[PDB]
């Protein structure tokens, strides 16, 4: 059993995904995607809500899988507040960079996921005491996916950056 934040985010993504099946992707994208038009810049939810949208069953499964594994591990070891903050920083910044790369029509939790992969691995290397670590077997496949990248390429790399950064900052204190 994984903590409340790990579960809340899995239920958010499932609720949204189900809505995308009923209403169709575009209808949901219209309301949850990153602002496509500056006029919309004050619709604050969009800097986060892009993360909740998935486009195929494999897309959701693969993301929630990693998120359960890694998110739950952060929540278990470092608390619910830590995972909230990793989520919010990484969703917002991976979104920001993904938009710049390729515009606003993107979604998926893998920005947050690559940030979690980055955080868990660095934090496990420089602070083995935290009780979190990523197997090199996983940091390998993680790297294999990256280079394989319709992927949100800016999200993957921005998320990863964010997760390394935060892990370093937290590994110093």
């Amino acid at each position: 059993r994984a903590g409340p934040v790990t579960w809340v985010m899995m239920i958010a993504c499932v609720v949204v995904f189900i809505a995308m099946q009923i209403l169709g992707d575009q209808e949901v994208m219209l309301w949850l995607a990153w602002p496509f038009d500056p006029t919309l810049k004050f619709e604050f939810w969009r800097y986060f809500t892009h993360a909740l949208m998935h486009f195929s069953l494999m897309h959701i499964l693969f993301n929630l899988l990693w998120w359960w594994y890694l998110g739950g591990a952060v929540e278990k070891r470092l608390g619910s507040g830590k995972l909230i903050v990793i989520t919010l920083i990484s969703a917002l910044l991976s979104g920001y960079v993904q938009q710049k790369f390729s515009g606003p029509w993107f979604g998926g939790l893998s920005g947050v996921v690559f940030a979690l992969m980055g955080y868990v691995w660095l934090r496990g290397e420089r602070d083995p005491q935290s009780g979190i670590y990523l197997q090199r077997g996983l940091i390998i496949f993680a790297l294999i996916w990256i280079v394989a990248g319709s992927m949100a390429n800016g999200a993957h790399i921005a998320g990863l950056a964010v997760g390394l950064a935060m892990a370093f900052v937290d590994s110093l204190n």
């Binding site: 992707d25 994208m29 892009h50 993360a51 998935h54 486009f55 195929s56 897309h59 693969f62 993301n63 991976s94 993904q98 390729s102 029509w105 993107f106 979604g107 998926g108 939790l109 893998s110 920005g111 996921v113 690559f114 996916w145 990248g149 319709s150 992927m151 949100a152 390429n153 999200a155 993957h156 998320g159």
Partner: peptide, 5 residues
């Protein structure tokens, strides 16, 4: 549309 992956 791009899948963040």
């Amino acid at each position: 549309v791009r899948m963040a992956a």
